[PDB]
Amino acid sequence: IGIRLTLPPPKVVDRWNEKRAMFGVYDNIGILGNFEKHPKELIRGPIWLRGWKGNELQRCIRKRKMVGSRMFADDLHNLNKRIRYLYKHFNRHGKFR
């Protein structure tokens, strides 16, 4: 029970598909391009996460600030509750003070 009885379908990786072969190209776009662009401008993703990092409370606060006016009501309500929950957790509970 719990362990598969046949080998899984073999996994073939093309180590030289175009995505892998060109990975990292232009990561020095600033230092090699007269700093017209910053490498963070190459990051694609949510508008609230490009070239920025934080813990989960900071991300939720940042997402609420920037796209919160555009969120669906159920999702915005969950985000409000999540911020409140993390607010209590990070400010009032834990081993260290």
């Binding site: 796209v67 006016s69 555009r70 969120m71 669906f72």
Partner: protein, 85 residues
């Protein structure tokens, strides 16, 4: 998912569609224009800058209106901009 437009802009998007779109421009201008009401139930600063008496520094001041409730009966009379507080 996200909405393309902020929800608070949805009412304004509606005015660009349908019968509202075809309303006369001068009427549509009146709607958009949200002029500040004359202060009635609060006393305005009268200036943009004031000296903070506690620390003696020039600080900016703002007039924040007092929310007013206008009962439906006021829409049949002329209360001069007064309402319930």
């Amino acid at each position: 998912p996200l909405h393309k437009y902020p929800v608070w802009l949805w009412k304004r998007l509606q005015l660009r569609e349908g019968i509202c779109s075809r309303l006369p421009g001068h009427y549509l201008r009146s709607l958009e224009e949200e002029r500040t009401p004359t202060p009635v139930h609060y006393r305005p600063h009268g200036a943009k800058f004031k000296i903070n008496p506690k620390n003696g520094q020039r600080e900016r001041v703002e007039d924040v209106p007092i929310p007013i409730y206008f009962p439906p009966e006021s829409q049949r009379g002329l209360w001069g901009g007064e309402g319930w507080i």
